[PDB]
Antibody
Framework: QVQLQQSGPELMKPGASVKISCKAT????????IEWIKQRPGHGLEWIGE????????NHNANFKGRATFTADTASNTAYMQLSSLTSEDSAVYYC????????????WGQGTLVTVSAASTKGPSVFPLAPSSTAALGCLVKDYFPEPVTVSWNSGALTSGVHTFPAVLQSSGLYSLSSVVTVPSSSLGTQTYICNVNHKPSNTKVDKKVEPKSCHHHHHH | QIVLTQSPAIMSASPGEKVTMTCSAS?????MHWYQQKSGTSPKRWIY???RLASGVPSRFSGGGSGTSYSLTISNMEAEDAATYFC????????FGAGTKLELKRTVAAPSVFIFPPSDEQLKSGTASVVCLLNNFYPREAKVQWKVDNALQSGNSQESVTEQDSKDSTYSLSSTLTLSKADYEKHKVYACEVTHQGLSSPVTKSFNRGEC
């Protein structure tokens, strides 16, 4: 099958330049153009440009005036995009896409790369539990992190029904916070183990947190 | 420039309902592509060359049009069709439409409310976080109020909401009240009060700082 694999998320200080990769497989790397598509909250999909790998040919979206330098490497099956000088207008998700078999439509899409442009420093998240009491509900609070994004899952992927991972919220502090919660029968909260897996690559953090019933020492039993 | 204009920017349909969005060019155009997007994932290409259904797309979908107006159409809306859909043509600039957020309307669901007191480990670091979950509800709008003892709280909480679930089509909301160790331990009762169309009577959830 056809696949495009993008580089991880990034933090760059304004006026520096990011170079982001797209690894193409399952097709003749030189038959198809590689298209680069931008997306900010609010502004939806805008086209940045394209490269036909190793024919020297590449097209700049007028808007960008030489800033979006589209290169490629035909025996690495990897196309690139460098963004020349950075403002926060660049803070977006960037995609690569390959056009169709016989048709000028973006038929295959990268997974996306979040670039954040800010002078602010990287911070890993503090992960705190959200402990059930009393269909019970539990989760984790992925607090005080920067930049976006973080991933969250449960039982290393094994648990997905009733999972709600919320949008991140920017805090007064200039740091982000989000919650992931899962609902589960409370007749399992004895020895059905629950762990939220929090990965935030910009700070190279990984946290595997057990959310436990904080059943205290004041009461009685169940 | 040829400018693509999409209508209606936001719309809602019940199951079985026939829906018809519209992408209009400020000039003439010979084809229209459509891509479907659900929050936080790559747009899937959906309908290409005006009418041709991309692999894997249900046949209840159909596209068409000509020259100055092209459209997207679902013969009978279904849960999994609720998404944002962008029209797109290469002679046009900007190249893409601004999209149409198609939502699925359905029978009302009252939110389950859960409250969470700050965790032990968090407290021993500086601040506090009391989280309130309004879970699995229809529609989006809900009122949440934080009641610390007597008082009501203003300018010290934040909200976040999921997109429409694919299964049931319900939302889910979370409120975080942030108040330091000091002011956390300077108080006793922590309440979360919830209003909703499905809620005939408000729902309150609470706990006392040192209690079980």
């Amino acid at each position: 099958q056809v696949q495009l694999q993008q580089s991880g998320p990034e933090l760059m200080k304004p006026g520096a330049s990011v170079k982001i990769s797209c690894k193409a497989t399952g097709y003749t790397f030189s038959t198809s153009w590689i298209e680069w598509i931008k997306q900010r909250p609010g502004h939806g999909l805008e086209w940045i440009g394209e490269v036909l790998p190793g024919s020297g040919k590449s097209n700049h979206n007028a808007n960008f005036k030489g800033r979006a330098t589209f290169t490629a490497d035909t025996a690495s099956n990897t196309a690139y995009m460098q963004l020349s000088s950075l403002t926060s207008e660049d803070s977006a998700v960037y995609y690569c896409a390959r056009e169709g078999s016989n048709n000028n439509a973006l038929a295959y899409w990268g997974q996306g790369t979040l670039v954040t442009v800010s002078a602010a420093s990287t911070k890993g998240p503090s992960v705190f539990p959200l402990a059930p009491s009393s269909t019970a509900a539990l989760g984790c609070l992925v607090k005080d992190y920067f930049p976006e994004p973080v991933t969250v899952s449960w039982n290393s992927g094994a648990l997905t029904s009733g999972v709600h991972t919320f949008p991140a919220v920017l805090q007064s502090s200039g740091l982000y916070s989000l919650s992931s919660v899962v609902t589960v029968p409370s007749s399992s909260l004895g020895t059905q183990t629950y762990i939220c897996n929090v990965n935030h690559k910009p700070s190279n953090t990984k946290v595997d947190k057990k959310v436990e019933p904080k059943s205290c020492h004041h009461h009685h039993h169940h | 420039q040829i400018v693509l204009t999409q209508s209606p920017a936001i719309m809602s349909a019940s199951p079985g309902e026939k829906v018809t969005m519209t992408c209009s060019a400020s000039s003439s155009v010979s084809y229209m592509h459509w891509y479907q997007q659900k929050s936080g994932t790559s747009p899937k290409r959906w309908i290409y060359d005006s009418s041709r259904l991309a692999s894997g797309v249900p046949s209840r979908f159909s596209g068409g049009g000509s020259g100055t107006s092209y459209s997207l159409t679902i013969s009978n809306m279904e849960a999994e069709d609720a998404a944002t859909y962008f029209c797109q043509n290469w002679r046009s600039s900007p190249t893409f439409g601004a999209g149409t957020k198609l939502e699925l309307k359905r029978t009302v669901a009252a939110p389950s409310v859960f409250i969470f007191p700050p965790s032990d480990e968090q407290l021993k670091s500086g601040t506090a976080s009391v989280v309130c979950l309004l879970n699995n509800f229809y529609p989006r709008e809900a009122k949440v109020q934080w009641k610390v003892d007597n008082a009501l709280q203003s300018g010290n909480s934040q909200e976040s909401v999921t997109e429409q679930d694919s299964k049931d089509s319900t939302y889910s909301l979370s409120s975080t009240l942030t108040l330091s160790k000091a002011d956390y331990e300077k108080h006793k009762v922590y309440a979360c009060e919830v209003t909703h169309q499905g809620l005939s009577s408000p729902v309150t959830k609470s706990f006392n700082r040192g209690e079980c």
